[PDB]
Amino acid sequence: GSHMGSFKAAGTSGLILKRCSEPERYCLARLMADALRGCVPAFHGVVERDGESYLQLQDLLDGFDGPCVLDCKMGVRTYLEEELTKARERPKLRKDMYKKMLAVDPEAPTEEEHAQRAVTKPRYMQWREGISSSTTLGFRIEGIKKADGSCSTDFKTTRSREQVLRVFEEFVQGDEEVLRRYLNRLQQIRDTLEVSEFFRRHEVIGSSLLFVHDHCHRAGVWLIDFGKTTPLPDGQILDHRRPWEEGNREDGYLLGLDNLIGILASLAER
Ligand SMILES: Nc1ncnc2c1ncn2[C@@H]1O[C@H](COP(=O)(O)OP(=O)(O)NP(=O)(O)O)[C@@H](O)[C@H]1O
Ligand SMILES: O=P(O)(O)O[C@@H]1[C@@H](O)[C@H](O)[C@@H](OP(=O)(O)O)[C@H](OP(=O)(O)O)[C@H]1O
Ligand SMILES: [Mn+2]
């Protein structure tokens, strides 16, 4: 029906406001003119509310009757290469990130991080990639919202192919029509990404695929969250499958989508 951190209710039916960020506004504007137009929420421009700038977006939940939502962060890498430079030259030590790390694996921090009670953001995000499916499969499940109002973010150690398959199995609750529609949509999104002028020219970091379905078997998938999507310099391009090595700006986005399609196709045959 409706999603209502960065989000505020819109006056217009079927819309939602997201706090405006310059990289995301730039990306959504380009995307409305790109092959990927239909694969992302409609962007209607910027509006002012309480002296603050908001993106006016399609409410992706509007068409659905009690939507189930799964957020799937795409890519082998989940931070910008400029974070690695900033961490080397002027590290901003993060005490919060030390605690969240220690909570999962007490042996994960180094002797020096224990002494600092703090880690760098890139170190934290790299660790998060390795205990989840990000490093190996190129995506990870971030969270689910169920039709029963229940929600979960308890997926930080969901890593193996079979562990991911079991989360989707529980998410679709044996609805063969929803799974088939999800797979048809992912196949069409992959085809669109492989021809998109935007996609070949941009490093797509920290974006998600949002899976939405309802008890009426309606099913949609959209790309969201372009806050860390940045253009490559002087007409250089990415293949989005080859391994990341600092300098090459590769994000493994399509490695992730390939594996995600493979897992849902496997689930469909179970
Ligand atoms: N256009 C949309 N319509 C409806 N729901 C949306 C829309 N965009 C985002 N959402 C919901 O809001 C969540 C957060 O979206 P996102 O754009 O990733 O924001 P964020 O502030 O970067 N949050 P996060 O990724 O968790 O750090 C999604 O997982 C959806 O549940
Ligand atoms: O999910 P946990 O383990 O809490 O970690 C979050 C991570 O999920 C999120 O993606 C990061 O934001 P970003 O994607 O804009 O970099 C955030 O950074 P920050 O906003 O704290 O700097 C981390 O703290
Ligand atoms: Mn996000």
Residue numbers in the entry: 183 to 186, 196 to 461
Sentences from the paper on this structure:
We found that l-scyllo-1,2,4-trisphosphate (1-s) is a good IP3K substrate. The main difference is the shift from the InsP3 site in the scyllo-derived compounds. This shift causes a distance increase between the Pγ of ATP and the pseudo 3-OH of the inositol substrate by more than 1 Å (from 4.6 Å in the InsP3 complex to 5.8 Å in that for 1-s). We observe that the scyllo analogues of InsP3 and InsP4 (1-s and 1-p) with an inverted pseudo 2-OH group (therefore with all substituents equatorial) are better ligands for IP3K than the natural ones, exhibiting IC50 values of 36 nM and 51 nM respectively, compared to a value of 140 nM for InsP3. In this work, the identification of unusual substrates (InsP3 and compounds 1-s, 5-s, 6a–s and 7a–s) that expand the reaction center’s distance from 4.6 Å (InsP3) to a range of 3.8–5.8 Å suggests that IP3K phosphorylates a range of substrates possibly with a strong contribution of a dissociative mechanism.
InsP3 3-kinase, a highly specific enzyme binding InsP3 in just one mode, phosphorylates InsP3 specifically at its secondary 3-hydroxyl group to generate a tetrakisphosphate. The structure of the IP3K kinase domain (IP3K-KD) revealed that the inositol polyphosphate kinase (IPK) family conserves the protein kinase (PK) fold organization in two lobes, the N- and C-lobes, binding the ATP in between them in a similar way. However, they present a third lobe, the IP-lobe inserted into the C-lobe, which accounts for most of the interactions with the inositide substrate. Summarizing, IP3K substrate recognition entails close interactions with the three phosphates in positions 1, 4 and 5 of the InsP or of the corresponding carbohydrate-based analogues.
